[PDB]
């Protein structure tokens, strides 16, 4: 379907070059996506509307949605349970949110852990051609978005806002970060399965 020629489009268009020369994620200029697949979650989709609208109607008839990628290594808990701020803590560079990307490369330097972790289960490659990854492409409702350069740990989106919007500067995020503070605030929209390939 074209639906999903379109997910696939923005997963290859959004990869970059990234600063730490592929440490996190892997070395590679595009991707072996294998399988798009649409989560069908209806108490997952109504808890996202429901939010939705309280948001929309908080930021002058606007939710400011966006689809935007996640890497995880509990995506499977989050197709099902859907994303959860208490499972978030104080120590990334906008406190204890909920993270997104609008590159999916960046995305992909969270799949096997911070940082990228040890890489993958089987082989302990943080740049593994062979092991099959998982992103998820979301439905973020951003509302308000607080614009911040610098360091900010929060806990809750700022008083009158509703995320975080982490825009590039000099030293400095290198890409855009997007950040909610209440689980309900995305939603799983499809699950991608892929390799990164070899340049
Ligand atoms: O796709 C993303 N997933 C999570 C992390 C992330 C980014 O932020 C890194 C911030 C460190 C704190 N995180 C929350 C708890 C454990 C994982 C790391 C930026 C953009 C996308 C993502
Ligand atoms: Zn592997």
């Known amino acids: 379907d074209k639906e999903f020629q379109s997910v696939e489009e923005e997963m290859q268009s959004t990869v970059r070059e990234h600063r730490d020369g592929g440490h996190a994620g892997g070395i590679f200029n595009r991707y072996n996506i294998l399988k798009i697949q649409k989560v069908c979650n209806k108490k997952l989709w109504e808890r996202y509307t429901h939010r939705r609208k309280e948001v929309s109607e908080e930021n002058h008839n606007h939710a400011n949605e966006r689809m935007l990628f996640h890497g995880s290594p509990f995506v499977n808990a989050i197709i099902h349970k859907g994303f959860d701020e208490r499972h978030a803590y104080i120590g990334g560079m906008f406190g204890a949110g909920i993270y997104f990307a609008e590159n999916s490369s960046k995305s992909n330097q969270y799949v096997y852990g911070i940082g990228g ?62 950040v909610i503070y209440r689980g309900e605030q995305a939603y799983p929209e499809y699950l991608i399965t892929y390799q990164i390939m070899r340049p």
């Open 117 to 178: 972790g040890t890489g993958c289960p089987v082989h302990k490659d943080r740049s593994c051609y062979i092991c099959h990854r998982q992103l998820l492409f979301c439905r973020v409702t951003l509302g308000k978005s607080f614009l911040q350069f610098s360091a900010m740990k929060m806990a809750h989106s700022p008083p009158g806002h509703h995320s975080v919007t982490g825009r590039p500067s000099v030293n400095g995020l290198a890409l855009a970060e997007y």
